[PDB]
From a paper:
HERC2ZZ is followed by HERC2DOC of unknown structure and function. To characterize HERC2DOC, we crystallized this domain and determined its crystal structure, refining it to a 2 Å resolution. The HERC2DOC structure consists of nine antiparallel β-strands and two short α-helices. The core of the domain folds into a β-sandwich with the five strands, β2, β3, β8, β5 and β6 forming one β-sheet that packs against another β-sheet containing the four strands, β1, β9, β4 and β7. The first α-helix links β1 and β2 strands and another α-helix, α2, is located between β2 and β3 strands. One of the open ends of the sandwich is delineated by the short loops connecting the β strands, whereas the opposite end is surrounded by the longer loops (bottom and top, respectively). Electrostatic surface potential of HERC2DOC reveals a well-defined negatively charged groove that lays parallel to the β9 strand and is ideally positioned for pairing with an additional positively charged β-strand of a ligand. Because histone H3 regions are highly positively charged and are known to adopt the β-strand conformation in several complexes, we tested whether HERC2DOC can bind any of the H3 regions using a pull-down assay. HERC2DOC does not recognize any of the H3 peptides tested, or other potential ligands, including SUMO1, Ub and the D-box region of CCNB1. The structure of the DOC domain (originally referred to as the APC10 domain) of the protein APC10 superimposes with the structure of HERC2DOC with an r.m.s.d. of 0.9 Å. The binding affinity of HERC2ZZ to the REEE peptide in the presence of HERC2DOC remained unchanged (Kd of 1 µM). We concluded that although HERC2DOC and HERC2ZZ do not appreciably interact, a conformational rearrangement in the protein may occur when the two domains are linked.
The E3 ubiquitin ligase HERC2 has been linked to neurological diseases and cancer, however it remains a poorly characterized human protein. The HERC2 gene encodes a large, 4834 residue protein that in addition to the ZZ domain contains three RCC1-like domains (RLDs), a cytochrome b5-like motif (Cyt b5), a mind-bomb/HERC2 (M-H) domain, a CPH domain, a DOC domain (HERC2DOC), and the carboxy-terminal catalytic E3 ubiquitin ligase HECT domain. The selectivity of ubiquitination relies on E3, which recognizes a specific degradation signal in the substrate and accelerates the transfer of Ub from E2 to a lysine residue of this substrate. Our findings suggest a role of cytosolic HERC2 in the ubiquitin-dependent degradation pathways.
Numbering used by the authors: 2774 to 2914
The structure:
Amino acid sequence: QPGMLLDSWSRMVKSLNVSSSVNQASRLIDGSEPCWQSSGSQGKHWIRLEIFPDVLVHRLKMIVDPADSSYMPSLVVVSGGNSLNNLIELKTININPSDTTVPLLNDCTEYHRYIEIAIKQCRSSGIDCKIHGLILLGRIR
């Protein structure tokens, strides 16, 4: 029913992909430890979601931990589009060293089939990042 909110990940997300440590990716959903930790090139990490076409993003957030030192994300770019070849920047977020819950998207009025969370920088220029979970709430249309 249009307008009602959703919090069941599997009813909103068709697929979840990550740039590295693919075997750990499911930790982003339930938020358990040890969390997803990238194993790739500095500033090139990403998480990509495909969203079912009757779901708008009501809330999208990520959980970080200041105790992670140089694994803590510090600069994140969120993009969305109708294909992975059509991603446009939606928001650039500068994370502060003491942040824990990081808002990424809210109250989207446009449908995004693909959403990308790109970790462009980590605290103290760490190479890899740790993200302790994603929070997704959807609105049916």
